[PDB]
Amino acid sequence: TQAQRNANDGISLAQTAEGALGEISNNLQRIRELAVQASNGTNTQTDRDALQAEVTQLQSEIQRVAEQTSFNGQKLLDGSFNGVQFQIGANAGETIGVSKIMNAQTASLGGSLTRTTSTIDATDLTKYDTAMAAGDLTINGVDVGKIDAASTAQERAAQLTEAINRVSSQTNVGASYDKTTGQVTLTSNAAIAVAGAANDATVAGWANNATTGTATTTTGINSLTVSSFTNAQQTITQIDNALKDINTARADLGAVQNRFTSTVA
């Protein structure tokens, strides 16, 4: 009958959303495994960079499923799906519906996070070639050790990222160097305490300051990285929140599917 055909479509739409959410969830699990790997402190910066490469392709796959998943031309997983009703009964207004579906876009997954971040431009490292010795920069009281004496600002930015990230898992401060913006960002769950013998942001990126960083709030997994131990630990936490959301979106889609199947029958 027509009611039956209406409700079957409600079924296929639910099944379509639920499948695509399962896809997203499996890619989230893959990112999470990569973040666990990135939280192996023996990793080099270059190791974490290659992990991040994989992380961004997985993020790219989640984002396209989130933005493309559709049923008969309605996007299901981009936040635009506010629910739909289907005429089932003998009179008008006798409907069953599918409820609204979560925004599964990477800018949304996992909800919100506030952390401390401090960002510098590599441009500002105008003494990239004043060598740093052991004790010149400390992060939360932890010596990041000696650094040669660099040849481009960029190189000092990369050396700093590396130095800092070697002690990341002890200081709870991790660095992330974006070669697109030319920026190195420190992130932490608290103020970053910068000290040492150099006291020159022009050599060491950051000058002495017990309260380095600004509290910053993000939503989703798309600004998160596995560039350091600290970054990766944020990534795991954020992804556990996303997985919890998807788990309940899919239970809910399971339920409505059941309800429609029982209605048709």
Cited resolution, angstroms:
2.0
Residue type, 42: T
Structural domains in the chain, CATH included, are 1-111+221-265 (1.20.1330.10), 112-220 (3.30.70.2120)
Copy the structure tokens of residue 134: 């052991």
- The C-alpha R_g of the chain, in whole angstroms, comes to 24
C-alpha–C-alpha distance, residues 205 and 190, integer Å: 19
Residue from 221, 184, 160 nearest 27 by CA:
221
C-alpha–C-alpha distance, residues 245 and 238, integer Å: 11
List, in sequence order, the alpha helices (H) in 85-193.
Answer: 153-166, 168-171
Angle at 214 between CA 211 and CA 219, to 5 degrees: 145
Residue 214 parent element (H or E): strand 214-219
Which residue in this structure is represented by tokens 């510098």? 120
Which residue in this structure is represented by tokens 């008969």? 72
Interacting residues of 192 by C-beta distance below 8 A, sequence separation 6+: 116, 118, 139, 140, 173, 186, 206, 211, 212, 213
Check if the beta carbon of residue 193 is closer than 8 Å to that of residue 210: yes
C-alpha–C-alpha distance, residues 247 and 251, integer Å: 6
Q: Could you report how far apart the first and last alpha carbons of the chain are, in Å?
A: 11
Q: How far is CA 128 from CA 102, 108, 159, 164, in A?
A: 47, 38, 10, 16
Copy the structure tokens of residue 21: 């959410």
Copy the structure tokens of residue 189: 């769950």
Check if the beta carbon of residue 165 is closer than 8 Å to that of residue 113: no
**What is the number of residues in the chain?**
265
Count H helices, E strands: the chain? 6, 12
